[PDB]
Design a protein around this nucleic acid. Structure first.
Ligand SMILES: [Mg+2]
Ligand SMILES: [Mg+2]
Ligand SMILES: [Mg+2]
Ligand SMILES: [Mg+2]
Ligand SMILES: [Mg+2]
Ligand SMILES: [Mg+2]
Ligand SMILES: [Mg+2]
Ligand SMILES: [Mg+2]
Lengths: 134, 205, 260
RNA sequence: CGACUCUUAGCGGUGGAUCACUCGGCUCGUGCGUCGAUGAAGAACGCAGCUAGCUGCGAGAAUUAAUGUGAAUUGCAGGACACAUUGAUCAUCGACACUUCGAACGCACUUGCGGCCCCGGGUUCCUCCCGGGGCUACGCCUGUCUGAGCGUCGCUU
RNA sequence: CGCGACCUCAGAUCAGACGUGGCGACCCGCUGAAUUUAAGCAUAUUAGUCAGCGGAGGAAAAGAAACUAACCAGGAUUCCCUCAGUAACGGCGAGUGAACAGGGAAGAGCCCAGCGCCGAAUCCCCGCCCCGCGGGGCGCGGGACAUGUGGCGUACGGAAGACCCGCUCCCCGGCGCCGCUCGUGGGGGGCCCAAGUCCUUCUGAUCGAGGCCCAGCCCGUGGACGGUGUGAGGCCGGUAGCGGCCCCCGGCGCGCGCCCGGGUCUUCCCGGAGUCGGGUUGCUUGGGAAUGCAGCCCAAAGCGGGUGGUAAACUCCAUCUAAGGCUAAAUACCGGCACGAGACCGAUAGUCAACAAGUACCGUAAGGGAAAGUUGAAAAGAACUUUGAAGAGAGAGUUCAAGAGGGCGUGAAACCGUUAAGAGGUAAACGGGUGGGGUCCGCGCAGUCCGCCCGGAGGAUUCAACCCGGCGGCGGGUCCGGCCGUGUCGGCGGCCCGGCGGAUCUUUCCCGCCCCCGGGGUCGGCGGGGGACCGUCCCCCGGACCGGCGACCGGCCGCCGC
RNA sequence: GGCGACGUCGGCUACCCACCCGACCCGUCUUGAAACACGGACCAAGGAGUCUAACACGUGCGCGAGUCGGGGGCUCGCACGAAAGCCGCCGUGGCGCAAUGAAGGUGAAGGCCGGCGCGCUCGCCGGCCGAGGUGGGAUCCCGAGGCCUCUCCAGUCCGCCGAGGGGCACCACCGGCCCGUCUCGCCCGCCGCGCCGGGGAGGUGGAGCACGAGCGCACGUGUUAGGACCCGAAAGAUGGU
RNA sequence: GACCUGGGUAUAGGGGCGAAAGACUAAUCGAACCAUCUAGUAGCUGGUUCCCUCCGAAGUUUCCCUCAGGAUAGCUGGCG
RNA sequence: GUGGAGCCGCCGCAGGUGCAGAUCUUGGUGGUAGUAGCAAAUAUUCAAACGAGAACUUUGAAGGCCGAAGUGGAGAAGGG
């Protein structure tokens, strides 16, 4: 149950901040779960998705057994595009259908200077919580 | 416009009363607001007693209320004289002072001198550095609490006498009548007239 | 309604001109130029007798009826006919004023809370609340209450030592102090007989908080438990008693229908 | 018989009721309670590669800097991927900037006409010669400078 | 003639500052109606409100008695409950209408002119330096203010000065730093539990089922929201005196600076004027032989003056000290900035405005002022072929669905087109009664009884009858063991290592005192405590009953399943 | 007891039609409307007795000579909690428990017995009880008598019972009591002897007493003040263009 | 010709201007137009939304600036 | 049958609580009705061209009007 008197609970005021979010809040909200090989190894539950991570889709019309890199991240439409999943138009020009990143499993990340530091900080914040369990 | 047997009423609503309406919707929220202002003040004066200074014993004025005893505003500046504490030092030790107060009874005087010496009795001051003028040892085995509540010495204590049981004696069961009141009331309203009739009788010569 | 809904110029046309005598907006140009303005008939007008915020919202009940209703609600939580006829499946449960020891008040982890209700055989009411995880019918969903739920057992204690932390995640369950009881929590819906789990130190304060009939209560200044209009209350015993049927005449069990 | 009309029904129109939805109101409560001559509020006009409105801005104009954040923006193109440079984007916002009108301030309001001082080029200029800059409203306070009086005197003539 | 000092005045683009205007919900000062009510209408009411004008501030105004009272007296202001719809006002009609007691919220008090004392001991501006940040203070030096009166002590609750008496050396601001903080100071950013398990439904699942004896996992985390439909575990978040990061505060302790207080006695000093008050006038008030305010004329006193609610004269008594000033909190807040919520409204509703809304549009202007939400999970927004000049079609295609085709969810009525059936000179429609036709349903159609018991005809299985073993139940019994309920008592037991209560008692108990002759006297008592007694609720045997919806064992009776 | 197949049996509604009979168009004011009275072309959506304060009576609930925290306070900082619970030397206060008079002010208990002052139309002391009496009065109590297979012996039961008794509430009447006034009269008391105080007997005025019934809360109805069931003027005023 | 006319300018609402018609003052004039007081008042017209069951009127008395309205008694219903 | 995400029964609670009317409010649609109408200022004709398509466009030819106080040539205010 929510106990803080400074955070909302209404449908109208959570739907307003979700569709009118700034684009740096909006990458925190387009997060994605990791695989079982990768959260046994980095011990972190989920990450915000970025440009070159490779993904298998877990729900929808396209499901499973196709690892593929993502290629474009519409934050305006809350939608990622993946290099393999596409759709033929009437014209004959195939274009990417877009899917939502909570319907998505990262199977290999993209590591730079900053993605290392974020995984390191999201991990250390868990074994502090394991030390409350005395 | 009226009807059969009812009241004849004068409702005072012939004025623009809907712009001046007061709704007590904040009255829960002002009760928890003025609780927090008591709590945040009680720890700001942290060792000092809550509800501030000691107040005097005061008898209420009227025929309706002069049987009862009430907390007052402050001590009359002659109690502080007789109890022996300075008037500009009284309010800094925790004694409410009212300089416009008269005591025209000795009985009401000495009850607040005794009230004030009993306060100074069970008071413990704190030094700045432990030099202690007119002050003794460590703070009364650390003063048994920190802060008192709703009065230093419980200001009402409106007490009544024992007067156990007497034997109905002679001339107590005989005289003091209703006629004692009716002769007293006519002696009040004819006192000024008769003393005029004494002056007329003495100028006969 | 926010203010006047009369923030609009409108006077009647009054005279002939073959339209009804409702006030019309002034001017021209716009669509809102001769339309009928304020009155409880009109699109855009003012509602009949607009609600005022100084309607009397809050009601008084005097204290010896609030205490009457909360002595009447505990006594019905101790009858198995009444507490099962409200919905709580108390079929597998032991002795019906369920009290437990005072160790439960110092639980802090809700795994110690779930198996207590399984070992008291009171978990099956909680599993009935999980089946009543419906969503709201009607327009109450956009007024932010979308999920309806059943009330389950209530646990009444004293000296909170963590009992409020172990139970507040379990759905449909309620905690209340044995000092400060609530008729809104003991009789949900106005109906009597909610299933309650007690504690030793809670169950022993009721004799000093409401008193018996012989001594008045000590934690309430001038309260003694209310008197009883009936002593014997099962009239299948009273009317079958020898004193009554010695005095009764005879039953007249014929019919005597209409003779043609 | 065939049309015309009438009443039912099937289907199609015309129309936008109904129900379902809700980034809006409305009410109550809480914390705070802050504009301006250092140019407010308000108004005008201008600003995008393709831009009319709205929204955001001010010739640094759909924003600069700084700090946080850490790869997008996106209707279409274009160009920087570099992030062990300074790093896209977004938020924040303390540094800089902020056209004209407006209490609106040189006088006018007709983008009208000035007046002093300084700086660049022409008469190497004082005397109504192009450009840039600064100053130039009214009331009023303390002080300073100038000085009015057959106002009150003093020494002198 | 001139020179100089001042006094009254002028000028400056003089040096440095200040005021203007906006908002105006709440607050202050003015000013001010009429609708309306009186069943008419003049006073009255509306209403000292609306509109007009001027000033603020986060609050404002008010505020430390020229008070209330009338008795055992209270003691600044504001606010709340009461006083109270009361005293009072009113064509005494309609109507209007306070205050003091009392209980609370909050609580805080002070300053000057005068009166005298002190060698003007005071302040402003500029010049350079001791020392400084983010600049203002003590110092050094002139130019001013000022004796027509700056500063010190001083205030009506008294004050000062001098004797004598008994004590004491303190406080404030800046400066680093160290330690906290009561929901746990505030601001900002970035993080922290657990199914995407198996089968299955679907366009797509967030559905349906399932998880050994640890209850499939998490839970201080089952608020909410996006997610291809209904999600504690997919993802924000939520929970947590949860962590870590940067920034900003309230107060320890080194150097400034500032430093005699009290008591008694004596001597001396002591207060606001065109104001009070009065007369008259107009408004205001519940204020009535005038509550307040104002104009005008008259105009004070100093044992004085105001007030004491019926004008007036005498008298006694009470009470305060006016015509100068400041002041926190409790209180108000329909405007602003940020929020949280709801038994509220759901696109003709809710703000005029859910949308490019105070916009489009209208009026010379003041001003008036709308209408207008929804394809889909995703544009996947219909390539291509063919008819036509195109709009528009016929195919094809996408989609769960175009029977969702760019104001496209659902798609009502009025109204129209067409099809099918029926009918038609008393406009139509209607009520009662049948008949005929059509659509549809039901049975299934010259084929509908369903269960019970009995005697039959062959077929197949196994209790029962009765007894033995058995656990469980019902009922009744000496109420045996346990049990209580009502009075009646005692052990006064636990009352002093027992609770509650008492306008019971005890001047022989106890704590400071009051009354008369350092003491004595109960010499009469005050407030506080102690234990005695009554009325109730706790333990043991005694007694009366009842075994009550309080029960277990024992033996009996008859059920019962194995 | 009988009769009937693959198109026949049974069935009814907002189906259509036909015939007989009956039948004027509603709402509305009105003595009277089918009216040559008014409103109504059609359809959808909207659309009119509300709240608040006061009072009255009815009803339900709690307590009851009382009653009620509404205003404050307390509780740990909790979503729900703008709730709930608590106070009690927080009951101040409101309403009720006492009326009456303009006010000064005064302020609701009688009956039976015995004795004596001229038992003198007037009275005084003491005991005993203690809200009077009369007439009706639900209910209750007593009840002679009576009621069953053979006659004399006895106890619960039961029903009928003429009559008698105690009489609730309420109604009518008589008597009394308190406060105001009026007539008539005498006596008594002394914080001090008076242009003092108190008492009596009769008649009257009062929203009174005569063994209390109120309070708080809820609901319903009625009336009133507020925009007041909804819509409607000709106006008046204020400030502006 | 007391002529016709443009632009400039002045006068404003119980006011203006009028060779006078109560003419004209922005299609408005025997008192403009805008906004507010304001949802002003009406004994007067119009309307007043579901079903069934039971009971069921009055248009008369007396007073009123009363006569299209009230108050009062009668008539009614509801509760006992 | 259409539709594509919510909904109802019971016991209590609470109302912005049910329409045929108000010359009601707003929106939509009829009948009248393919009707009234497209009649003030004399007037059109032939051929051609471009075009899917010509009573109206253009071009030539004829016939007419305005007739110099103009249906001609330029301006002011106004428009933008
Ligand atoms: Mg909201
Ligand atoms: Mg619904
Ligand atoms: Mg259709
Ligand atoms: Mg301000
Ligand atoms: Mg920048
Ligand atoms: Mg220049
Ligand atoms: Mg619409
Ligand atoms: Mg009719």
């Amino acid at each position: 149950m929510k106990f803080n008197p400074f955070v909302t609970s209404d449908r109208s005021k959570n739907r307003k901040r979700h569709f009118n979010a700034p684009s740096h809040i909006r990458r925190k909200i387009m997060s994605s779960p990791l695989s079982k090989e990768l959260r046994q190894k980095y011990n972190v539950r989920s990450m915000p998705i970025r440009k070159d991570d490779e993904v298998q889709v877990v729900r929808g019309h396209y499901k499973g057994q196709q690892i593929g890199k993502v290629v474009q991240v519409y934050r305006k439409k809350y939608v990622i595009y993946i290099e393999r999943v596409q759709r033929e138009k009437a014209n004959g020009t195939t274009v990417h259908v877009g899917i939502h990143p909570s319907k998505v499993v990262i199977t290999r990340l993209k590591l730079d200077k900053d993605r290392k530091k974020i995984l390191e900080r999201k991990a250390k914040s868990r074994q502090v919580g394991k030390e409350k369990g005395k | 416009a009226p009807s059969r047997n009812g009241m004849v009423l004068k409702p005072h609503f012939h004025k623009d009363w809907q712009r001046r309406v007061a709704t007590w919707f904040n009255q829960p929220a002002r009760k928890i607001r003025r609780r927090k202002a008591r709590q945040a003040k009680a720890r700001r004066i942290a060792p000092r007693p809550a509800s501030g200074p000691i107040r005097p014993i005061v008898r209420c004025p009227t025929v309706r209320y002069h049987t009862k005893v009430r907390a007052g505003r402050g001590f009359s500046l002659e109690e502080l004289r007789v109890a022996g504490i300075h008037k500009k030092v009284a309010r800094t030790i925790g004694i409410s002072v009212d300089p416009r107060r008269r005591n025209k009874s000795t009985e009401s005087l000495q009850a607040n001198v005794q009230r004030l010496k009993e306060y100074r009795s069970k008071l413990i001051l704190f030094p700045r550095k432990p030099s202690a003028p007119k002050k003794g040892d460590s703070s009364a085995e650390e003063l048994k609490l920190a802060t008192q509540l709703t009065g230093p010495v419980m200001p009402v204590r409106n007490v009544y006498k024992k007067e156990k049981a007497r034997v109905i004696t002679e001339e107590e069961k005989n005289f003091k009548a209703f006629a004692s009141l009716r002769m007293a009331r006519a002696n009040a309203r004819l006192f000024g007239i008769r003393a005029k009739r004494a002056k007329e009788a003495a100028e006969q010569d | 309604s926010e203010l006047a809904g009369h923030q609009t110029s409108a006077e009647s046309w009054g005279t002939g001109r073959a339209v009804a005598r409702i006030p019309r907006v002034r001017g021209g140009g716009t669509h809102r130029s001769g339309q009928g303005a304020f009155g409880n008939m009109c699109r855009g007008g003012r509602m009949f007798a607009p609600t005022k915020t100084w309607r009397r919202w809050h009601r008084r009940v005097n204290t010896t009826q609030k205490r009457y209703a909360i002595c009447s609600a505990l006594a019905a939580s101790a009858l198995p006919a009444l507490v099962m006829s409200k919905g709580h499946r108390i079929e597998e449960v032991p002795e019906l004023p369920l009290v437990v020891e005072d160790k439960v008040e110092g639980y802090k982890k809700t795994k110690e809370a779930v198996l207590l209700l399984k070992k008291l055989k009171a978990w099956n009411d909680i599993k009935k609340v999980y089946a009543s995880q419906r969503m709201r019918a009607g327009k109450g969903k956009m007024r932010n209450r979308r999920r309806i739920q059943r009330r389950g057992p209530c646990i009444i204690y004293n000296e909170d030592n963590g009992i409020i932390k172990a139970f507040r995640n379990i759905p449909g369950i309620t905690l209340l102090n044995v000092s400060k009881l609530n008729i809104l929590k003991l009789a949900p819906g106005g109906h009597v007989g909610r299933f309650c789990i007690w504690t030793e130190s809670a169950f022993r304060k009721l004799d000093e908080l409401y008193g018996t009939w012989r001594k008045a209560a000590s934690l309430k200044s001038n309260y003694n438990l209310p008197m009883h209009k009936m002593i014997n209350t099962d009239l299948s015993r009273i009317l079958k008693s020898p004193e009554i049927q010695r005095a009764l005449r005879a039953p007249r069990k014929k019919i005597h229908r209409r003779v043609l």
